[PDB]
């Protein structure tokens, strides 16, 4: 404690109590013998950056390539490409989820991510806005964003997308400043398809945060469509 006090003197010298105590100790001793960024001088501001890629084996990692292309990678082999686009690739109204489950050919982790995304959308109420293709075990899901902006399919989908690819997703978004938290883009479709692994993260670092945060959103804001769930 004495040595610690000796090495921490400059920060305590300013206190008048500390000066008084030092003077008293010195007087008692004498009478007895007679008979690059710096802070507070000693603290250097340093930084670290986390390598989220190391988590790839146990949790999904989202990142953004550019305004239109975003990815959620699962492991080192597979993932989902999420593209905001004006070019639709499905021109029918089916989403044959039941048959896809019965055939059981798809990646189970990817189907889990799709389920989490869809269940997280607030107030989804136009089933015709969602089209899908799961033939052969593939995953292809197309959300129609075409049209107050708050009570629209486009807004709910975009809110979920903003969370799912949080970090880098904003550059596609905030283009039409809506009421409250409501989002609007010029894009007509959001497309989600399975892809192979590739280093796509030019715009934002890979990150599990959006997905992990979205887990608690599942079912919070769905509507009832029947009396017995």
């Amino acid at each position: 404690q004495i040595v610690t006090f000796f090495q921490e003197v400059p920060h305590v010298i300013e206190e008048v109590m500390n000066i008084v105590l030092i003077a008293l100790s010195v007087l008692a001793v004498l009478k007895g013998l007679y008979n690059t960024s710096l802070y507070k001088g000693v603290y250097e501001l340093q930084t670290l950056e986390l390598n989220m890629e190391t988590l790839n084996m146990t949790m999904p990692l989202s990142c953004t390539k550019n305004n239109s292309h975003h990815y959620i990678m699962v492991g080192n082999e597979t993932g989902l490409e999420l593209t905001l686009t004006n070019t639709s690739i499905i021109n029918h109204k089916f989403c044959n989820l039941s048959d896809a489950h019965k055939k059981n050919l798809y990646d189970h982790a990817l189907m889990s991510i799709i389920s989490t995304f869809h269940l997280s959308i607030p107030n989804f109420n136009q089933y015709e806005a969602m089209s899908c293709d799961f033939n052969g075990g593939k995953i292809s899901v197309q959300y129609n964003l075409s049209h107050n902006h708050c009570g629209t399919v486009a807004n709910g989908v975009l809110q979920t997308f903003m969370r799912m690819a949080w970090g880098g997703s904003y550059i596609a978004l905030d283009s039409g400043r809506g009421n409250w938290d409501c989002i609007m883009t010029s894009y007509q479709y959001l497309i989600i398809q399975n892809t192979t692994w590739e280093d796509h993260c030019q715009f934002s670092r890979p990150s599990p945060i959006g997905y992990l945060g979205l887990l608690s959103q599942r079912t919070r804001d769905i509507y009832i469509s029947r009396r017995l769930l």
Partner: antibody, heavy 123, light 106 residues
Framework: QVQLQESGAGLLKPSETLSLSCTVD????????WTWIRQPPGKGLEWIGE???????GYNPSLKSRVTISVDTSKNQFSLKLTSVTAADTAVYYC??????????????????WGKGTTVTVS | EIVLTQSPATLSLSPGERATLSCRAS??????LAWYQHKPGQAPRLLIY???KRATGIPSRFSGSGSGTDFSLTISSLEPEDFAVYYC?????????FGQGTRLEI
């Protein structure tokens, strides 16, 4: 280097079924709109329709009731089936590869690779 | 449905002269137009896409311009192998449309 090799009989009697096919040799089958166009003599280019590798389709409404388009991704081919041919279906028929860019403004679309074409006369 | 009208119907110009071809949409376009050259006996050939970009192998003589409803194709100093029919072309989602076409003649 991409080629679109076209096949199918162009000689038909009225009310028969025109059945043309086009095989793609080069580059991917995914990410394109495989398109059928026709040019009847004395007229300009007319879009018959198009299809993806997901077998999603779009058709000209003036022919929608009679046109079917299909894909076979195993052999990288796509097919046009037109029914109840009348003299109005005499034309040169083209298969073409379309590409649509909708990721940023300005969006664009084109038909860059075309087949040779088939003369389809009915009488 | 977005439709296209090409002007003029026929265009008579001397070799080495500048040629301007117009395409008028009926609405503000869903995508920037494409321009094809078509010669009798052969398939149409893609000249311009996105209203301003030259396709592969297209000489720098061909240029394009336009926005909204008005689009133009320009040939600066046309060569004798340029006299053909020219089509503008638009696509909305799952709907492709052409113009009637302009015949460029000597």
């Amino acid at each position: 280097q991409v080629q679109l090799q076209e096949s199918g009989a162009g000689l038909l009697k009225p009310s028969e079924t025109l059945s043309l096919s086009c095989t793609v040799d080069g580059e991917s089958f995914n990410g394109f709109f495989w398109t059928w166009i026709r040019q009847p003599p004395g007229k300009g280019l007319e879009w018959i329709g198009e299809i993806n590798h997901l077998a999603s389709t779009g058709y000209n409404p003036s022919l929608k009731s009679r046109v079917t388009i299909s894909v076979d991704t195993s052999k990288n081919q796509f097919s046009l089936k037109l029914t109840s041919v009348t003299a109005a279906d005499t034309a040169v028929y083209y298969c073409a590869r379309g590409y649509s860019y909708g990721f940023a403004w300005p969006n664009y679309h084109y038909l860059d690779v075309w087949g040779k074409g088939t003369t389809v006369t009915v009488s | 449905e977005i439709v296209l009208t090409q002007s003029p119907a026929t265009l008579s110009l001397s070799p080495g002269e500048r040629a301007t071809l117009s395409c008028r949409a009926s609405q503000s376009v869903s995508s920037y137009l494409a321009w094809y050259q078509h010669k009798p006996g052969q398939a149409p050939r893609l000249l311009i896409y996105g209203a301003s970009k030259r396709a592969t192998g297209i000489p720098s003589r061909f240029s394009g311009s336009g926005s909204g409803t008005d689009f133009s194709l320009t040939i600066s100093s046309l060569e004798p192998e340029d006299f053909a029919v020219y089509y503008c072309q638009h696509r909305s989602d799952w709907r492709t449309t052409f113009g009637q076409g302009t015949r460029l003649e000597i």
